């Protein structure tokens, strides 16, 4: 099938571990610290991953950072969603950090994690493929609606290149459903909505000052 | 072209006036009261409009209301956006209520109205047509991601019928751009984001209790 899709597949990062501190008592603070620390390390990996997207590295450093600052949480959430597809009512933040309803309640994340589980439910019903997941991650980055873009035409070209990849993949692999590409694009509003819910919640956590956060995570959060 | 598109065009409601009270001094309260009153009357019209969407009235009354309660602000905002396409840095809430930057600041709506203006800017660049606007309004309704749907398969059918209409319209009218339908769908995340910003802001206004709101508007806001 489509070369861009194949390329994104081989550029897919290895999974990383959450490593919750086994000496620390379980608490909302522990859970939130673990998740923010995981997100910080995933962000480093995402920045490295983005250089493999055709045309992305040719953008100005400012536009690269604008896209990332707008899209980072959508990319993080798409990851948890994809890792969670073979599970039921649990979120696989990492192989060693799987959150069920009880844990979500303990962390103060019941509403957010239920929203993420709504995304999981929809992609389950659509039988989301890894090929589609990696392409949607790239599309979310290109389509992230930053207000600070310098070269708008180049960003549009990036959107178009990735959209074409999705269109082509679906036309070849899913002839039984001539509207599958569009159905995939129609999942992006819920991703955007859920990401905004997450950013707002963790921004509040940042303000309260009880959960330690690393530099990159804080930078993205404050952007 | 496509029959569903033609149908949605003839089902398009007439414009309504804002009628700000000429005896009341200008204030943030006046502006916000005017806008909420306008929105209340537009919601009545939207409910009437939705019965013309193929298949919508065959849904249970509960599912009809779930869709509307999720999508109402996206539909309102799409309306202001479309009315504003031939203007610059102004929002045409009604023929008699056009908001510029100064008015937005006075109303406490600078951030929200700038976000809406970002939608306007994007649709301007794409040369959004009335045909596309009415179809996107219907798609936003069907794709509104309510968590309370009874007949999920029927709602999916509704999404599919309207998506097919958009696909068919673009294939016939815009052969020069085989990705135009997808580009249109890719504007929906920003619509969702902007709508959520609006709902959250006016929910806060509701809590503060200084701006009078009518029953239907309050019901939608509280849903
Ligand atoms: C605040 C980030 C948190 C919600 C999170 C989301 C996704 C992920 O992969 C790691 C952490
Ligand atoms: C709170 C509703 C307000 C933002 C509004 C939005 C669109 C519209 O057509 C009328 C009012």
A76 lines ligand 1 (CB under 6 A): yes
Q: How far lies B103's CA from each of B42, B76, B98, B210, in Å?
A: 21, 19, 9, 19
B74 lines ligand 2 (CB under 6 A): no
Q: Taking CB atoms and an 8 Å limit, are A143 and B118 in contact across chains? A: no
Q: Which residue in the block uniquely carries the two structure tokens 């779930």? A: B66
Q: Please give the Cα distance from B119 to B187 (Å, whole number).
A: 8
CATH of the domain at B116: 1.10.565.10
* CA B33 distance to own-chain centroid: 19
Around Cβ B217, how many Cβ atoms within 10 Å? 22
Q: Please give the Cα distance from B151 to B62 (Å, whole number).
A: 10
Q: How far lies A67's CA from each of A57, A96, B117, in Å?
A: 12, 30, 20
Q: Which residue in the block uniquely carries the two structure tokens 């997941």? A: A133
Chain B contact residues (CB < 8 Å to A): 118, 139, 143, 145, 147, 159-160, 163-164, 166-167, 178-179, 181-183, 185-186, 188-193, 196
Q: How far is the CA of B37 from the centre of ligand 2 (A)?
A: 9
* CA B52 distance to own-chain centroid: 16
Q: Please give the Cα distance from A83 to A89 (Å, whole number).
A: 12
Burial tier of A136 (Cβ tally within 10 Å: 0-12, 13-18, 19+): buried
- CB within 8 A of A208, min separation 6: which ones? none
Closest CA to A77 of A127, A30, A136: A136
A180 near A153, Cβ under 8 Å?
no
B116 near B80, Cβ under 8 Å?
yes
Out of B179, B181, B196, name the one closest to residue A160 (CB).
B179
Closest CA to A194 of A79, A56, A107: A79
B72 lines ligand 2 (CB under 6 A): no
Joined together, the tokens standing for residue B38 give 């306008």
Q: Which method was it determined by?
A: X-ray
A108: left (phi over 0), alpha (psi -120 to 50) or beta: left
Sign for the CA dihedral angle at B47, B50, B55, B56 comes to negative
Q: How far is the CA of A138 from the centre of ligand 1 (A)?
A: 18
Q: How far lies B81's CA from each of A186, B7, B89, B117, in Å?
A: 20, 21, 11, 8
Partnered with residue B97 across adjacent β-strands are B94
Joined together, the tokens standing for residue B140 give 């936003």
Greatest alpha-carbon pair distance for chain B in Å reads 53
Q: Please give the Cα distance from B86 to B92 (Å, whole number).
A: 10
B108: left (phi over 0), alpha (psi -120 to 50) or beta: left
Q: Please give the Cα distance from B135 to B199 (Å, whole number).
A: 23
Whose alpha carbon is nearest atom 9 of ligand 2?
Answer: B76
Range of the structural domain that residue B126 is part of: 1-223
Sign for the CA dihedral angle at B126, B130, B132, B135 comes to positive
B4 near B165, Cβ under 8 Å?
yes
Domain tally for chain B? 1
């Amino acid at each position: 099938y489509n070369k861009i899709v194949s390329h994104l597949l081989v550029a897919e990062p290895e999974k990383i571990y959450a490593m919750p501190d086994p000496t620390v008592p379980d608490s909302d603070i522990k859970a939130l610290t673990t998740l923010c620390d995981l997100a910080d390390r995933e962000l480093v990996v995402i920045i490295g991953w983005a250089k493999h997207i055709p045309g992305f590295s040719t953008l100005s450093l400012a536009d690269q950072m604008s896209l990332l600052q707008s899209a980072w949480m959508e990319i993080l959430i798409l990851g948890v969603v994809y890792r969670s597809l073979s599970f039921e009512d649990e979120l696989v933040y990492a192989d060693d950090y799987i959150m069920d309803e009880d844990q979500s309640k303990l962390a103060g994340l019941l509403d957010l994690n239920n929203a993420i589980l709504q995304l999981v439910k929809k992609y389950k019903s659509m039988k989301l493929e890894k090929e589609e997941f990696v392409t949607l991650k790239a599309i979310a980055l290109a389509n992230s609606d930053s207000m600070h873009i310098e070269d708008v035409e180049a960003v549009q070209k990036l959107q178009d290149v990735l959209h074409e990849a999705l269109q082509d993949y679906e036309a070849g692999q899913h002839m039984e459903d001539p509207r599958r590409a569009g159905k995939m694009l129609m999942t992006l509003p819920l991703l955007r909505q859920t990401s905004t819910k997450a950013v707002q919640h963790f921004y509040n956590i940042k303000l309260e000052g009880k959960v330690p956060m690393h530099k990159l995570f804080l930078e993205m959060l404050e952007a």
